[PDB]
Design a protein around this nucleic acid. Structure first.
Ligand SMILES: [Mg+2]
Ligand SMILES: [Mg+2]
Ligand SMILES: [Mg+2]
Ligand SMILES: [Mg+2]
Ligand SMILES: [Mg+2]
Ligand SMILES: [Mg+2]
Lengths: 677, 676
DNA sequence: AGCCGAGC
DNA sequence: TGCAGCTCGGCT
DNA sequence: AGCCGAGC
DNA sequence: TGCAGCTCGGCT
């Protein structure tokens, strides 16, 4: 009676209410599948209503948020529930329009979270209903077609699982999962889970209690929530971000690509199994370059990707904005290192690696940030050039210098107040005895938000505060801040006595006591200092420069051997020592073997990293026998031989220094061109 | 005076006060244009400029119903913001004191659809307040975020005012927007198309409404027909043609998301419109329920809609996949691509002016379109009957008449006369209390029939009494089955009258507007489908002639190419020629002196408007081995035979080969569809 | 009270 | 993630 | 009173 | 085509 998306049961509200089931689905697409499966007979005792994703965690949400939540209220009216009302006896159960709620979500982790949020909602307001068997779920395999829907519902018994309340263990499990006062308990809860899962990874491998649902099904979401929200220390990426970079590297676009088009390409090439809107969000976040976002954006923002006016919220639609790799991206993630990574497999398709190994700790450059379950991560930005200098110091066996947070193009100051605590201050100075000027806001204070929440209440006053200024004007650009503020002589004197930065809200505190990351083994770890992050990154990256040299010696050696055989075959051919004309394939192969020619050395070497093949010789064109091509082939062979020796003479440290120098050169050119443009 | 219930309005600071008549309301084409306008206005612009966005085309209020005008959110928002009043004259300055803005400035894209929005706004002011046009009420802002502030700083260079100069302006606006002036629009556009052909055999700040209509809006009306009226040759409109051109170039072997393909089409074919229209077109090309396509060229992999809701129940284009049908390239043979005139956007090659299918696809899937002045509507026709008529005409026989035919339609289509048909569903008496409905007429959707026919029969429906006692549904996704219960009395009287009549199971189909573009791009009205079939036949037969001339030349060039390659290989394995350690230029001159031909395929392709022996010397060293020499000799002889076998065949023979190959796969595909 | 961002 | 208005001509 | 579909 | 709710943890 007033619920647009509701397909109410025919007998709902009448005398057969307690025999009616309300099916709450995960989204409208799931609703139509349920309505399709119920046929026509299902309308008498089954209603369908869709949930628009995650619902409110009512256990500790404010009363205002609970009263104004449309989805919670819709469920209450459809079922006929009432707050504070107990459902103990059978007399109280008559005011309900439905006797059972059947949750129908995807059989993935986020579906389990929605189930738990519904369980948390009923358990917090009507615990007596759970002891009556009010909640159940409809299981599916792994959405599907209309024909499959009617086959699931025809076999309703095999897909219907009922939740069971068995004692206070169920209350404690629900509280463990959804109470804000149980964050530390969730840390221990997940710590035991991650530890136990490693033990069995080294070895092997119709009723459901709420305690078993929390501790055996919901925990898979909570852990997966951390795996997708807490970045890796090695490359500073989360898996979704890493899939984007992997796709951009594999495409190697030389011209702009629409963000929406790229998102579709990422989902296909990297097996991204979530909605594309989140993926398009990730791409926009990876491309932003305004003050307070990325110190080095790996994707270029070609279009309106947001400004410091609205903290990037003013970005245009992803169907109208373009992007492509920054020229620094491949200097930070050298393509040769791809041969050293562990690439994952989804549906037997090879996808992104478990991590990339950049030349500097990218987790410190762009400020890794993420919210999971139990833990969260928050890192500020750090200066790329200072990071390089500390890497160069550690390569010389010296201790790295301490580092303060640093944001590109930020004109203010960041001062250390204590361990992992910092004061971030904008810029304000007195012009005359009636004027101050504000030329910088602290990091992540957006211009429009500062205007509306600080300067307008200072100009007009509120119901709780007086006016402080008489006027202000704005002279901003898209990337800078300039407020000119007018005050009386008296008010300005009082503002200076109290502190201009304090009065004008131009100083904010930055506290970094939750630097939680996945280490290189995939273990969640809390890091107390950025130096600890830098050190753990340094040893791994240096070791991989060792692996890269071993790889290059083998690969360049095989290429040298290959050119030696090809050059030998051409020289022996243009002199009459060997002939192939009108010879059979069998005789030609057995002859090349008998004369000491090697099977494809590059293919052999690549297969070693896991009949004779002379195609690398006989697929050469007939041009190969002509004079200029013989001279060209001999010079290429001799040049590769010198290339092997030049590489053998370099240390892993030398290779790292070459990469760092090449990166700094392009970083200077790009950042200088940015200031020109 | 202020406005507070319109979220998307950025009202001017002085609007509503004493400076109202000096304030300008900027109406933009969409929210993105609004944000660009507020960006360009700086800070000073907020005092005398308001901005409000229009969400696309607005209501043509001329001759629109009173209910539609009263309930239109865009029209009412404009009235509330400006302060206008219906039936009020604005002659003197005393009447102008009730307006909150003195001017409206239209800001649209400088394309045809933007011109249409300008005209629709002009039509709205002209129909209700013609006195305002005589005061200079309407103006426009021309374009060719930082660029926005530069446009507004140079405001008067971009600002053009509309001018009323006499009854020619009233007549011009009425010509464009009055339902009583369709025939005048036909004449209006016929002269334009004719005048444009003549000049292609050879080579201010005020603007009157008559010049805007006859020199700017007419460009929209014409391009509206070019994108909405299909071509006779392939049955496509340009947007549909860009999609198939893109699918052909991609040649996907696996399913592709519709939204992804739409983005691929915009890039590869220079599609300059919104993605939503393009995703519409793709879904429409893929649908295969009863009443849509007889041969869908794209496969519907996912929920593309059903006959339950006429396809409006299709899932989002982000969740459904598509791919070429195996029939598409049998209908549009790739070899014929070498005969088409491909178009150019900027400097990129895009889709052709038309494809030339082996059968008139314009009849198979029912061409349909609404333009300006004209519209097109064709029913579906049977593919096999059309193949049979093509075979008859190839043998000099007369083609059989064809009735409309819809795939999987179990009903009846009867000819009442020329271009007039009775389309009937199926209903039969089960017992003396039950009828059963097993088919609805073509394009009557199941849910619509239930709500608009069966429910009024079951319930009240105003003065008419209830006629049935109950009904049950036993539909599938592709079939219809209603079982209806009645008393013996009202069933007998319903049976006494027409059962198909009483239950609304008969619809008429009239096709007196078969308007298409002919092969030259001329708009033409066809009286019968035989006229369409004949004109298609003469063109397609001629192009099978061109295919033979093209293939004989190309296969001949390939034959010459292989002859030289085989000659070089035989002379090399015998010692008659050596290349070892010879310089490039000596080897080139040596090959010339022995009669070796420069690349014959390249020469032939350049003929269709130093020596190149790369086709010989890029061959691998494998070429000199025994098995590769025998293989090269056999390939050379097979191409020679292929050229000769082709020169003996007639263009009719090639057409019959294609038709048989098409029918063979059509039988296989349609048998697999009925199994699934 | 609300940001941050990868999910629904 | 799902959802919504209009044009234009012929026809019912 | 509204469908059909390529556009905004 | 633009628009909108929520989770989860640390912190202001
Ligand atoms: Mg899911
Ligand atoms: Mg960041
Ligand atoms: Mg446009
Ligand atoms: Mg059609
Ligand atoms: Mg009409
Ligand atoms: Mg919170």
């Amino acid at each position: 009676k007033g619920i647009p998306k509701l397909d109410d049961a025919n007998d709902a509200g009448g005398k057969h209410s307690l025999e009616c089931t309300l099916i709450l689905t995960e989204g409208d697409s799931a609703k139509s599948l349920a309505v399709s499966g119920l046929g026509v007979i299902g309308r008498d005792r089954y209603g369908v209503f869709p949930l628009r994703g995650k619902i409110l965690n009512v256990r500790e949400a404010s009363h205002k948020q609970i009263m104004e939540n449309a989805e919670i209220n819709n469920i209450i009216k459809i079922v006929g529930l009432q707050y504070k009302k107990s459902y103990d006896d059978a007399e109280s159960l008559k005011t309900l329009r439905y006797g059972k709620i059947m949750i129908m979500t995807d059989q993935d982790q986020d579906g389990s979270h929605i189930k738990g949020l519904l369980i948390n909602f009923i358990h917090h307001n009507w615990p007596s209903l759970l002891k009556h068997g009010f909640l159940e779920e409809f299981i599916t395999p792994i959405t599907s077609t209309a024909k499959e829907a009617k086959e699931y519902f025809a076999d309703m018994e095999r897909h219907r699982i009922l939740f069971r309340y068995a004692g206070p263990e169920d209350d404690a499990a629900i509280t463990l999962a959804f109470s804000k006062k149980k964050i530390d308990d969730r840390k221990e809860w997940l710590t035991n889970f991650m530890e136990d899962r490693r033990q069995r990874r080294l070895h092997g491998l119709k009723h459901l209690t709420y305690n078993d649902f929390i501790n055996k099904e919901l925990i898979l979401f909570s852990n997966s929530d951390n795996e997708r929200s807490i970045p890796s220390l090695v490359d500073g990426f989360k898996p979704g971000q890493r899939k984007v970079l992997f796709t951009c590297f594999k495409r190697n676009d030389k011209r702009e690509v629409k963000v929406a088009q790229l998102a579709g390409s990422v989902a296909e090439m990297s097996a991204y199994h979530h909605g594309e809107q989140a993926l398009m969000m990730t791409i926009v976040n990876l491309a932003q370059n305004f003050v307070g976002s990325n110190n080095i954006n790996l994707l270029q923002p070609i279009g309106q990707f947001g400004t410091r006016l609205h903290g990037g919220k003013d970005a245009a639609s992803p169907r109208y904005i373009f992007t492509m790799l920054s020229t620094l991206a491949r200097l930070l993630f050298p393509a040769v290192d791809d041969n050293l990574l562990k690439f994952l497999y989804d549906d037997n398709q090879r996808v992104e690696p478990e991590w990339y190994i950049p030349i500097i700790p990218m987790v410190l450059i762009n400020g890794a940030e993420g919210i999971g379950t139990g833990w969260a991560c928050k890192l500020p930005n750090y200066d790329a050039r200072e990071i390089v200098n500390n890497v160069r110091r550690m390569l010389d066996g010296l201790d790295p210098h301490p580092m303060l947070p640093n944001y590109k193009n930020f004109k203010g100051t960041i001062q250390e107040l204590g361990q992992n605590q910092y004061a971030v201050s904008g810029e304000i100075f007195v012009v005359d005895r009636n004027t101050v000027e504000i030329t910088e806001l602290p990091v992540r204070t957006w211009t429009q938000v500062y205007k509306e929440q600080v300067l307008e209440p200072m100009l007009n006053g509120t119901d709780k505060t007086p006016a402080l200024i008489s006027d202000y004007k704005e002279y901003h650009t898209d990337t800078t801040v300039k407020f000119v503020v007018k005050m009386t002589e008296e008010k300005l004197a009082q503002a200076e006595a109290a502190g201009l930065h304090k009065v004008f809200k131009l100083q904010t505190t930055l506290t970094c006591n939750s630097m939680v990351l996945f280490d290189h083994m995939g273990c969640l770890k809390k890091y107390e200092t950025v130096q600890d992050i830098l050190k753990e990154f340094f040893d791994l990256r240096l070791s991989y420069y060792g692996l890269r040299k071993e790889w290059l010696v083998g690969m360049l050696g095989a290429e040298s051997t290959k050119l030696n055989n090809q050059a030998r075959f051409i020289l022996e051919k243009i002199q009459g020592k060997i002939t192939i004309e009108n010879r059979s394939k069998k005789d030609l192969i057995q002859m090349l073997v008998q004369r000491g020619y090697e099977s494809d050395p590059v293919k052999a070497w690549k297969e070693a990293q896991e009949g004779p093949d002379f195609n690398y010789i006989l697929n050469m064109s007939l041009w190969s026998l002509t004079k200029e091509k013989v001279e060209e082939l001999i010079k290429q062979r001799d040049a590769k031989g010198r290339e092997v020796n030049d590489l053998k003479r370099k240390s892993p440290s030398d290779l790292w220094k070459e990469d760092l120098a090449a990166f700094v050169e392009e970083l200077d050119k790009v950042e200088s061109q940015e200031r020109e443009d």
